[PDB]
Amino acid sequence: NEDCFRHESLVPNLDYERFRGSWIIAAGTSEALTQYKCWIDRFSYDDALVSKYTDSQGKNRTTIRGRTKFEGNKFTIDYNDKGKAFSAPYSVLATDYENYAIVEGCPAAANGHVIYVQLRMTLRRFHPKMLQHYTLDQVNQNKKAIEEDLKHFNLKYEDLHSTCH
């Protein structure tokens, strides 16, 4: 769906290997996605993806797995029949690779379109003493940068639905 994307990426030459890793989705423009809390995407190896999220009460833990295909900033996810509502074209609009990324995509689950902000999930910064606090602090630590890129796409972090709290 190279036609469903609405913005031009600031990282058209996205380095997949640097983008690879775990990411927690902190907030986005889709009210329908608020149903899946503290969503964590784990991109690994050549084209593997493991996505995990819960119910709004921390329960109903769910995992869906898929295969990715990247073309610069663009990538498709093909989830196993389970998670089909999330299979779709996506595009990394901005990222510093080490801390955050802003992604646009067109999954049916988001009523066809969403722009979300994700922060890197790593044991280097995460000490399970929980997820919500981790996400908030990471957003706060990178607020300046996130706000600036978001601004570039006519959005404000405050205008997004929080999807991990």
UniProtKB/Swiss-Prot annotation:
Q: Which SUPFAM superfamilies match?
A: Lipocalins
Name the Pfam families on file: Triabin
Q: Which residues form a coiled coil?
A: none
**Has keyword Signal?**
yes
Q: Where in the cell is it found?
A: Secreted
Q: Which InterPro entries match?
A: Calycin (IPR012674), Triabi/Procalin (IPR005657)
Q: Does the keyword Cell membrane apply?
A: no
One term under GO cellular component? extracellular region
Q: Which residues are glycosylated?
A: 60
Record keywords: Allergen, Glycoprotein, Secreted, Signal
- One of the protein's GO biological processes: symbiont-mediated perturbation of host defenses
Task: Please report which protein family the annotation says this sequence is part of.
Answer: Belongs to the calycin superfamily. Triabin family.
User: Function of this protein?
Assistant: Probable ligand-binding protein.
Please state what the protein is called. Allergen Bla g 4
Q: Which organism is it from?
A: Blattella germanica
